């Protein structure tokens with residue numbers, strides 16, 4: 001397992017931490033949503049939650065990443081939920097497929 | 113009408129407030145985007161706006177929730193915009209389909 | 225080029241800054257993701273990043289906007305990544321297709 005702290009930012013201005021799949025995977029439209037492994041695990045920095053989003057270049061190549069919420073205290077593996085939209089998409093190991101964005105977790109009075 | 117304050121968080125670490133449809137609905141891919149009723153209404157806590165996102169397990173079962181922005185001062189019913197991606201999806205009353213995430217509303221000088 | 229500061233908010237409570245395409249474009253499902261030009265350019269306010277999301281009415285009409293992250297220091301043109309989901313979608317110049325939401329850029333110790 002590797003923690004979120006091992007992720008790298010592409011540029012100091014980059015909002016997202018880059019996520020790659022640990023496996024080579026081929027996706028076709030008829031397969032529907034697939035969960036790609038990243039080898040990266042929660043949990044997140046105190047008072048933050050995580051949002052998995054696609055990268056634009058990848059989206060433009062026909063791979064849709066479904067927005068995923070990562071809870072602050074999730075300790076499992078961060079997976080990228082993805083689907084080939086129109087064509088056959090091939091994800092090579094180490095292609096940066098998605099990005100993790102950290103956001104403030106707002107405290108509310110909602111019953112747990 | 114029920115307010116956002118009646119929503120529950122699944123776990124103290126959960127970023128999102130769970131949203132269910134008030135109706136049993138069946139969705140097929142050819143139907144395209146559908147707005148599912150929740151019976152939950154804005155408005156939101158001061159200085160926040162809302163983001164509707166899917167839950168991972170639901171997404172993986174073939175129900176896409178389209179990211180929806182809920183304005184701070186929206187007083188209508190919060191609906192979940194959803195589409196079956198590949199197969200026939202059946203949403204039973206009370207299945208938690210989506211989640212509402214609260215985010216800080218940043219003030220800017222943009223003209224209203 | 226027009227800066228983000230020229231965008232307007234629909235209502236004081238509106239979380240998002242409205243985005244239109246500068247061109248009339250027709251989209252069919254088989255075209256897959258398309259990048260629509262807005263004529264609006266980064267960069268963003270200090271300590272913020274941007275999220276491009278769809279508007280609900282547009283989504284309901286069959287135009288999917290893929291969530292896009294705009295980095296704080298991006299100085300290029302903000303484009304909307306879009307796809308017609310089921311039917312032929314026609315985007316007239318000046319239709320407000322998407323919205324830009326500004327979010328806090330959280331500082332982390334991740335290696336750049």
Ligand SMILES: O=c1ccn([C@H]2C[C@H](O)[C@@H](COP(=O)(O)O)O2)c(=O)[nH]1
Pocket residue numbers: 052066067068069070071074077078079080081166167168169170
């Ligand atoms: O794209 C996603 C979405 C969720 N999760 C993990 C982190 C979440 O905290 C956990 C539970 O997600 P839900 O089923 O409640 O959405 O699943 C992911 O790894 N990737």
Ligand SMILES: O=c1ccn([C@H]2C[C@H](O)[C@@H](COP(=O)(O)O)O2)c(=O)[nH]1
Pocket residue numbers: 164178179180181182183186189190191192193278279280281282
């Ligand atoms: O998934 C969504 C998106 C929007 N709205 C409501 C709240 C928004 O403030 C309002 C207007 O949305 P737009 O058409 O401007 O996106 O619609 C929803 O109920 N669900």
Ligand SMILES: O=c1ccn([C@H]2C[C@H](O)[C@@H](COP(=O)(O)O)O2)c(=O)[nH]1
Pocket residue numbers: 054055056057058276290291292293294295298301302303304305
């Ligand atoms: O919907 C989008 C997503 C991205 N970008 C621009 C701003 C980003 O900073 C830049 C790089 O995006 P990525 O390829 O790294 O996601 O592209 C857009 O104009 N629209």
